[PDB]
Amino acid sequence: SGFRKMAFPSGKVEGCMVQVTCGTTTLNGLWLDDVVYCPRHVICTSEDMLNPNYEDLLIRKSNHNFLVQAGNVQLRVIGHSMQNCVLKLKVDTANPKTPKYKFVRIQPGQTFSVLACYNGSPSGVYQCAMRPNFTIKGSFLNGSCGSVGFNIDYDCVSFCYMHHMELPTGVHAGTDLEGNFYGPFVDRQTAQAAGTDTTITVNVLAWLYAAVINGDRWFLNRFTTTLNDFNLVAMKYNYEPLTQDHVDILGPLSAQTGIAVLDMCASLKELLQNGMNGRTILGSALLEDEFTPFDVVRQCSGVT
Amino acid sequence: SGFRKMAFPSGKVEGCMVQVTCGTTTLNGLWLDDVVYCPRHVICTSEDMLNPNYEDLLIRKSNHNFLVQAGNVQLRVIGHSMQNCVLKLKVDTANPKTPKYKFVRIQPGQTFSVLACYNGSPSGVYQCAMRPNFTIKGSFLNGSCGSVGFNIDYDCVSFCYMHHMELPTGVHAGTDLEGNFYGPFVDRQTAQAAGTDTTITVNVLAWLYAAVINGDRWFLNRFTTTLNDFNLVAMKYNYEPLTQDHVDILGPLSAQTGIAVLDMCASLKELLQNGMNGRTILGSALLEDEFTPFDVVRQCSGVT
Numbered sequence: 321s322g323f324r325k326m327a328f329p330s331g332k333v334e335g336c337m338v339q340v341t342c343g344t345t346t347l348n349g350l351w352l353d354d355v356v357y358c359p360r361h362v363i364c365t366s367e368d369m370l371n372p373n374y375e376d377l378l379i380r381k382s383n384h385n386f387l388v389q390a391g392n393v394q395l396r397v398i399g400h401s402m403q404n405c406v407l408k409l410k411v412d413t414a415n416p417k418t419p420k421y422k423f424v425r426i427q428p429g430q431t432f433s434v435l436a437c438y439n440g441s442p443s444g445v446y447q448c449a450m451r452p453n454f455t456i457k458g459s460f461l462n463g464s465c466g467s468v469g470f471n472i473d474y475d476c477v478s479f480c481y482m483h484h485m486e487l488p489t490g491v492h493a494g495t496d497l498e499g500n501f502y503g504p505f506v507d508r509q510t511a512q513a514a515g516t517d518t519t520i521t522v523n524v525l526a527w528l529y530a531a532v533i534n535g536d537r538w539f540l541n542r543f544t545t546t547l548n549d550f551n552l553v554a555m556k557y558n559y560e561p562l563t564q565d566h567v568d569i570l571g572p573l574s575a576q577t578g579i580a581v582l583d584m585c586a587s588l589k590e591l592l593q594n595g596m597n598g599r600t601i602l603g604s605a606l607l608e609d610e611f612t613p614f615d616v617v618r619q620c621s622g623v624t
Numbered sequence: 625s626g627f628r629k630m631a632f633p634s635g636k637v638e639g640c641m642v643q644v645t646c647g648t649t650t651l652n653g654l655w656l657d658d659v660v661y662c663p664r665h666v667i668c669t670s671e672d673m674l675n676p677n678y679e680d681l682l683i684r685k686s687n688h689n690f691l692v693q694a695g696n697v698q699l700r701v702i703g704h705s706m707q708n709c710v711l712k713l714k715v716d717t718a719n720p721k722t723p724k725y726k727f728v729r730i731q732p733g734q735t736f737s738v739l740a741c742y743n744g745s746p747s748g749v750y751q752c753a754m755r756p757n758f759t760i761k762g763s764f765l766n767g768s769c770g771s772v773g774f775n776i777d778y779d780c781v782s783f784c785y786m787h788h789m790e791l792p793t794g795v796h797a798g799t800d801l802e803g804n805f806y807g808p809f810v811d812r813q814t815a816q817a818a819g820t821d822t823t824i825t826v827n828v829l830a831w832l833y834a835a836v837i838n839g840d841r842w843f844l845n846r847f848t849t850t851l852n853d854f855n856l857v858a859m860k861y862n863y864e865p866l867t868q869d870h871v872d873i874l875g876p877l878s879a880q881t882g883i884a885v886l887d888m889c890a891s892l893k894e895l896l897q898n899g900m901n902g903r904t905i906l907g908s909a910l911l912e913d914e915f916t917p918f919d920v921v922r923q924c925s926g927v928t
């Protein structure tokens with residue numbers, strides 16, 4: 321028993337981290353097979369970040385200008401290309417530590433682990449959710465750009481995020497591994513509006529099921545609700561509308577606990593309307609939305 | 625910016641995890657050099673766990689009864705010994721992935737990362753604190769025994785915890801790597817009282833400094849206090865008494881923020897007496913005590 325904000329073991333990803341330097345800018349890159357992936361803003365100067373023409377900036381660069389270092393060994397760059405907001409540096413050596421991997425574009429509300437890196441060296445690992453507004457609330461300092469987010473299914477690492485920037489609001493924006501930003505963000509030092517964020521309703525319900533499995537049951541009540549009634553409450557409290565697809569994904573947890581999804585919705589409704597009255601659930605005094613129904617099943621079943 | 629409950633990158637530890645089987649019991653072991661360390665309760669049956677005589681149980685076992693598997697390769701056991709509550713299985717092969725390592729006994733209030741494992745395979749990583757009462761609030765299921773806690777200083781892994789059991793209260797107990805339990809616990813299926821736990825005051829103050837560094841400042845007030853006055857409040861709210869040693873360790877954070885430690889104590893005093901009035905600090909609606917002053921400096925400075 322016990323329920324923690326658990327990240328995937330980061331070993332397979334640590335073996336892919338490298339340092340990429342271009343001019344005076346140093347950030348992190350991801351070395352998979354004979355390609356190193358990194359944010360294209362590695363080619364920017366301080367005057368450039370305000371409004372960069374990446375095409376023109378990249379033209380002034382040659383293969384020998386990209387310094388890629390894996391630990392203490394230097395990699396030889398034999399090609400460079402820009403794909404959306406990522407640079408792909410072809411190297412003459414395939415990473416011997418390349419795990420089985422996929423590049424995936426995750427959906428808002430899904431979770432992943434981040435391996436925060438500086439100068440190509442791993443500093444820490446944490447689990448987070450892609451917010452409904454396509455930002456992530458991470459922990460990143462200057463130099464963390466190029467750190468990646470991922471999920472692991474047995475031996476396969478699905479890379480889903482590469483860190484690009486911190487918005488003036490302190491939240492984080494980045495791309496999939498094809499260099500496409502999540503959300504409306506652009507890789508420019510300009511004020512950028514992150515949309516209105518909402519709470520990931522299906523994740524809060526999944527976490528309420530995790531609480532019941534672990535003995536925290538005080539919030540269970542004698543009530544039920546309907547999807548329509550619950551969604552009137554969700555709208556008022558800036559929660560994502562619950563759909564039948566969300567109910568369907570909660571099926572295994574509803575089956576394990578014997579608590580019908582709409583009954584758990586009625587507990588959530590009362591928690592939204594009345595608050596927690598100074599009580600806690602799984603060591604939290606707020607409703608947690610960073611665990612998906614899959615995370616709850618995985619953590620509660622011990623998937624390795 | 626941003627502040628997360630960050631674990632150490634687990635790669636160096638993943639390379640040490642093995643599966644240990646004895647009779648019908650399977651748990652995790654830690655393979656360092658030519659020794660595999662695991663909880664001695666791997667030699668227990670179901671009738672034995674209620675009141676085991678480990679000395680007698682181990683006498684009925686031979687080197688060939690301990691099945692140690694690293695991934696898919698079988699290790700050859702050439703010696704076995706019990707040291708306190710851990711079994712040390714000498715193998716004929718030194719682990720090629722053995723990192724630089726130390727065995728350390730951590731103090732209550734200190735933090736560490738846990739790599740939860742099942743059948744010798746890593747499932748996830750999370751950061752936690754050794755509670756003042758020597759329990760840990762982890763996430764462990766049956767089969768997780770032998771999973772370890774550790775800290776990393778550049779290339780050196782300091783192993784500080786090995787998981788042994790879950791108390792009837794759902795909290796976790798284990799040993800240092802010399803097999804000495806943290807706390808009064810014994811490796812027996814019997815009701816065991818964990819002492820009264822307290823909140824780790826120095827960690828809450830460190831986390832309040834992290835909040836200020838990251839822009840969460842609403843809790844800062846126009847007041848100050850004394851160590852004596854603050855400790856009267858800490859006693860009432862079951863917080864650990866703050867000492868000058870704790871003030872001294874908060875020195876760098878006090879210096880970085882320009883907020884005197886006793887002034888931060890006065891903010892904490894008001895938060896204890898008045899609550900958070902429905903507000904949050906670093907995304908939490910309660911006072912967080914799982915970050916040490918060292919963790920806050922490390923996370924805020926990007927130590928890799």
Ligand SMILES: O=C(Nc1cccnc1)NC1(Cc2ccccc2)CCOCC1
Pocket residue numbers: 361364368369370372460461462463464465484485486492506507508509625
């Ligand atoms: O976003 C970060 N820092 C960072 C800090 C903390 C967390 N995450 C990132 N760095 C900048 C990246 C950038 C953006 C667009 C074009 C060119 C470069 C933006 C700010 O100015 C310095 C470069």
Ligand SMILES: O=C(Nc1cccnc1)NC1(Cc2ccccc2)CCOCC1
Pocket residue numbers: 321665668672673674676764765766767768769788789790796810811812813
């Ligand atoms: O503690 C765990 N399970 C577990 C589950 C979840 C989290 N952590 C551990 N397992 C037992 C270990 C034990 C203790 C003392 C002597 C002999 C063996 C105790 C309960 O009965 C089964 C063996």
